[PDB]
Fold this sequence. Notes:
This is part of a larger assembly, with chains A (151 residues), B (112 residues), C (77 residues), D (91 residues) and E (53 residues). Chain B is of the alpha+beta class and 112 residues long. Helix content of chain B is 26%, strand content 9%. Chain B has one helix at residues 82-110; strands at 19-23, 29-33. Chain B is rod-shaped and about 95 Å long. Chain C has a four-stranded mixed beta sheet, with helices on one face. At the A-D interface, loops of A face helix 1, strand 3 and helix 2 of D. The structure holds two RNA strands.
Amino acid sequence: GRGAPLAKVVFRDPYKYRLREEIFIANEGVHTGQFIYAGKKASLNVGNVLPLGSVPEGTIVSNVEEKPGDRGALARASGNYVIIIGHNPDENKTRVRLPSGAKKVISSDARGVIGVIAGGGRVDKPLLKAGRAFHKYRLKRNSWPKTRGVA
Amino acid sequence: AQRVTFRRRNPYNTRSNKIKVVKTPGGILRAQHVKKLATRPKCGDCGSALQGISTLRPRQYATVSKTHKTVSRAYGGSRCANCVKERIIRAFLIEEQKIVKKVVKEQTEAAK
Amino acid sequence: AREITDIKQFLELTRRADVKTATVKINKKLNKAGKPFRQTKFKVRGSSSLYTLVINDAGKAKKLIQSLPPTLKVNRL
Amino acid sequence: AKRTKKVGITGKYGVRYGSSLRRQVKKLEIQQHARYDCSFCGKKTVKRGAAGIWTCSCCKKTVAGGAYTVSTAAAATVRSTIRRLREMVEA
Amino acid sequence: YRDAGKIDKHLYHVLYKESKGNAFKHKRALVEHIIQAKADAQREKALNEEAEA
RNA sequence: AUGGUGAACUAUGCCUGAAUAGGGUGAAGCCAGAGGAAACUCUGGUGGAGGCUCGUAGCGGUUCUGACGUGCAAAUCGAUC
RNA sequence: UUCAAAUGAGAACUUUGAAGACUGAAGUGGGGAAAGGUUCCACGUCAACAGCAGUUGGACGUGGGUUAGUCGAUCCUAAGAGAUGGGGAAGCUCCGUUUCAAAGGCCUGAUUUUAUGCAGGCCACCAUCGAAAGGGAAUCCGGUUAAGAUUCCGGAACCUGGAUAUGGAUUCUUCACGGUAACGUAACUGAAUGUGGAGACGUCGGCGCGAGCCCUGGGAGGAGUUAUCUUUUCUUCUUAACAGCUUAUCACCCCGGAAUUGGUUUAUCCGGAGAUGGGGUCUUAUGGCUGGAAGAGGCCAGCACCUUUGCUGGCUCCGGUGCGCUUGUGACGGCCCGUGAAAAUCCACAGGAAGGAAUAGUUUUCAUGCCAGGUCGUACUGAUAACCGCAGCAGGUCUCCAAGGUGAACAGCCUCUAGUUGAUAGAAUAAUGUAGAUAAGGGAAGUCGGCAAAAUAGAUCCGUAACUUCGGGAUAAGGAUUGGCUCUAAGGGUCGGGUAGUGAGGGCCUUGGUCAGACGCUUGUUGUAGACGGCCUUGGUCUUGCUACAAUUAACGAUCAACUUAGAACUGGUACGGACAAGGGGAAUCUGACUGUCUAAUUAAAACAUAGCAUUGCGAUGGUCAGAAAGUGAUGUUGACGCAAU
């Protein structure tokens, strides 16, 4: 039911001796075995997740947090991204351009993962058959087929 | 040609109901139930099947002797040779570079 | 069960203090492309297995059948 | 011998689904099922499995990419934007 | 015939590609086709030895 | 109107399994050959795609407005589908 | 359907025997799931039911019958249900079920009133239910009842829980060796914690291999025909669970190094990230020999037992082929804006706690020995008489096995095994009917409408237009052949590339015996073979390393068993897809693009649906929708390439 590939990233628990698996939306350009870095001091490369306040002008990111700790709400679909269009150091805000063109200002502390999401350009292929629609919608929800209300 | 029938009470053919017909000594064709096929153990790193380890159903592994459950290598019945071989390389070389990282740091900061 | 083909060890399991009965079987079988011979089988019933010792030459049968202990109940033929 | 004149792979749909829809479908399936070079081993062994997952048959190195292309053109400049934006931090 | 020793390794590959295709119809059709290939190869080989001398 | 029962039939979704002879057509991809200076184009093989097709098992039922129509049947039987 | 006999007061129907047929193995045959509940089997019996009858019964009265450590339920969890802590609700109760709950047991040590407390190391999962075709620890064969069996008898196994030793390995290099390596050797310490594998798994297509069955040669028996012929026809010739040795693709390892690129599948993938080649390792599906096990089953000859029954006995053997059907498996390839389940459980690795030597301590995931495996189901039908349709009602109900021939074929048609011969009957057999048919000449003139029937209708060769979304239309339209006998040609597999001396002629038979040359035909009498066979020969006893001629071409020679295709003569009162089987075709017009779906019981449609196109709302302290509230929810395990409304 998702057109974007997932990623299973393992983060070593620092508090206790064990491993924690994490499910990340695979940003296009990431590969298995890549070192995905999370935190303030992370470098600027595709795949890493950083707060918006730590990145300079012109960067596009994805899976950003509406609030500092919901672990990502915005720009999660395939091929979507949000652009950094200015910082607000006063009262620690940052405003960005959503994929729908809406401009929203959020906290500079909320995190976001660098890079666009893989699976873009998916809807450029015509869906052709009814069964292809049936196969697509058999795993998403019961929202197909649609019957006109006039009939 | 003689024709056979099920011996259990399930009348449907599935993976758990596989049937092989055998020539019984009494001169009649009898259906013989076959257990599901075993799958080769797989390496944890490369995913491929690892050689030297007996293949059998999970619960029945508790009966086979250790000679078919442990090769004489490190990471015996979990990893397969080449994965272990480069695991040594990765461990040895990174620790080798780590002290190289340390010695340069002690020199640059001292001359700072 | 299984089959063992060593004479010396076979006597050891006869008085192994768990065998109660034993049987001897005679078969008239063929060989190669020549005349047949006299073939015999010696069977020993253990507690959980049934050992056996096949001998295709009656020459070795004599010294072995006498070697069976008298306390062993043998079902002749 | 060029068995079919102009429809190639999309000719399997017979005569249905119009001409442009088949043609537009035709364009994508050419590179969807094509063979790409790998960035880790440099072989013609990159094929698409699942929606947007590109795997290499040799060395098992899977690269995330577009739904129908290893590197979609709309995001090839995204890393160019980031890489051009990285050096200003240092110099 | 590759392991027979009479033929070379390279001429194997040429016929193998063609046998996957056509112009080789049956067992007999191949055998003299192989022969004339060796016969042709022997033709210039004999002529090359005398031409150099 | 009040209060209870019903998806064993059928309506829809999910989980779990099960079933679908035999032929026709012939897509990519591939191989060989030919043409030409190139671009590239034709010939001959494989290849099995294709919510394709003729057609049994199965699912519905178009027509005879056949049979029956106080019936074998509160809607079934036969042929043609 | 018919004949005869038996029983019976009472036979078109009961039984038996003899014929004639049918289902034709996608059964009118064998077993089951749900359902039924004793219909199962025996005795006796006909007032009632079996729309005729009936001494017959799925009926009546009386009784018998279902045996489990291994087959299942038991256990796990899926979609989902639901109890606590909580929050609503006057309330019956509703929400959620890990969320605003301080929600648990657990190994080491203490021991010697410590019973088990206590002092530390600890881990935190976080009710329960929920799929006798989802996962699941372990068994088969022979035989035996009136009715039971993978359950009973006999024989032969394996698994789990527990207790204890015996034997082996280990060790003063105290917790093993070998191989360069993939890894191996029956055993060959080891906790908390962490990690990994199995369970665990899409569909389709072709290919390889295995099993069951089909076809068939030799031989050992029986039965059938025999006016004539047929080394003829049919039939038996079988081997289980479990165990030892051994065996494959795939994959990996050592040497080596590549263009004059080479290996290679039906299907073009692979190779300096290292091929081809040479040599090895591994999983053991499967298969082979052996044990079980030939004393078992089967086919045959003599013995005589009103009987209860057996004994003596023989064989139960050696093969071959295949696009053969069913099925299993392996390496693959195609498909996707579908990439195609979870947990219990089991094992392994990292780690190093803890303990340990030889006067012996471990080793009970090495071999052997001892004990136990509780409860519940097991009979029968499973269908035009055992289930549901008021009935024994042509209706409906899930699934495994499935032979021979013609034939593409699980099509139609006939038959072998098996099972029925059952559904009221007798005589003439008027109209009118129901179901099959045939009609001289014309031919749709009939009718609202060629509605119903009819014609072509299989296969091979030739040939095929308008238009088009270039894929189709298109087996378009339209032509030529088809039987039988005797031939011709083509399409493969497996082996062999020499002579003279030499070594083994690892069969060395042969002449002598040496001595295991022995059993077999209660000691001995003395009688027999030595199983004519280990051990050495003076030897005539079709594979060869060495040299020679010169070794090569032409390529040859020997065996084997399949069908497919094409062609040539002859032949038949010109018949040949001879029965069955099986497309009418073309010019157009209205309309829906197509596949698909609905008014299950009068409308299958140009109606709905479908892809495509466009618009609208929504950046979650949200958009749409539910609830009586809620600390409630659906989208949402979601994020603008998304959800929702059109």
